């Protein structure tokens, strides 16, 4: 489905944000390049939250429609809940 037929909710709901944070902090902890300029942090979860507030997570989320179809929303494209 193209962007014309993009029917899921534009807001990043809490499960998606919770999993994105975990899977991004896991990557950062494993020496992944950091997308945002950190001001000095050791905890990778804080770095992932900083990226979330910066909307620069290099993850596209695949929302599976119950019929079998799926949409691909960008993290920067999703409106953050908080």
């Amino acid at each position: 489905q193209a962007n014309q037929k993009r029917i899921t909710t534009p807001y990043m709901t809490k499960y998606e944000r919770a999993r994105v944070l975990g899977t991004r902090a896991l990557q950062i902890a494993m020496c992944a390049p950091v997308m945002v300029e950190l001001e000095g942090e050791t905890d990778p979860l804080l770095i992932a939250m900083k990226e979330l507030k910066a909307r620069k997570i290099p993850i596209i989320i695949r929302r599976y429609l119950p019929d079998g179809s799926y949409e691909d929303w960008g993290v920067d494209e999703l409106i953050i809940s908080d």
Binding site: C31, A32, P33
Partner: protein, 171 residues
């Protein structure tokens, strides 16, 4: 036969090797991990022609790396049963005949070699020849062999040739 087919393989990327250029890393990974490999179903993976499609990267739940399904044109070769193929002789033995087809070593045993084509270690090169000394198959010759069967062991295939049928031997 030398084949040009499309093969699907999954490449695994750790976040440590994401980098600014990500797809080039995947291309290098594919160009390293399948090249020179051999499968029992598709034979020798000779070369990858062109990386056709890069699939969506599914991050494995819980574990860190991402997964890339990749379709790519690849040059391959797999030995068959019953075909005459050109070969280079690598060693002549009293028990058999060591021949080469690209990267594949082929063993042509003497019982599968006709009675006229006898072995002589008295020659300076140990070679196969007849009593008339017309057909002399020795080291580094260009011959044709009849592939009877192939055996795969330790992820590579070696075959057995024969010279029973007509027009088999030195070119």
């Amino acid at each position: 036969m030398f084949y040009h087919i499309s093969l699907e393989h999954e490449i695994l990327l750790h976040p440590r090797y994401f980098g600014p250029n990500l797809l080039n890393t995947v291309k290098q990974k594919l160009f390293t991990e399948v090249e020179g490999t051999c499968t029992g179903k598709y034979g020798f993976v000779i070369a990858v022609t062109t990386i056709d499609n890069i699939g969506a990267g599914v991050i494995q739940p819980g574990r860190g790396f991402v997964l890339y399904p990749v379709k790519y044109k690849a040059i391959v070769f797999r030995p068959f049963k019953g075909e005459v193929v050109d070969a280079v002789v690598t060693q002549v033995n009293k028990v058999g005949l060591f021949t080469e087809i690209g990267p594949m070593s082929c063993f042509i045993s003497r019982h599968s070699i006709p009675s006229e084509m006898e072995f002589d270690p008295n020659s300076n090169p140990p070679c196969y020849k007849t009593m008339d000394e017309d057909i002399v198959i020795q080291q580094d010759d260009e011959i044709r062999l009849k592939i009877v069967g192939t055996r795969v062991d330790k992820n590579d295939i070696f075959a057995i040739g024969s010279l029973m049928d007509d027009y088999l031997g030195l070119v």
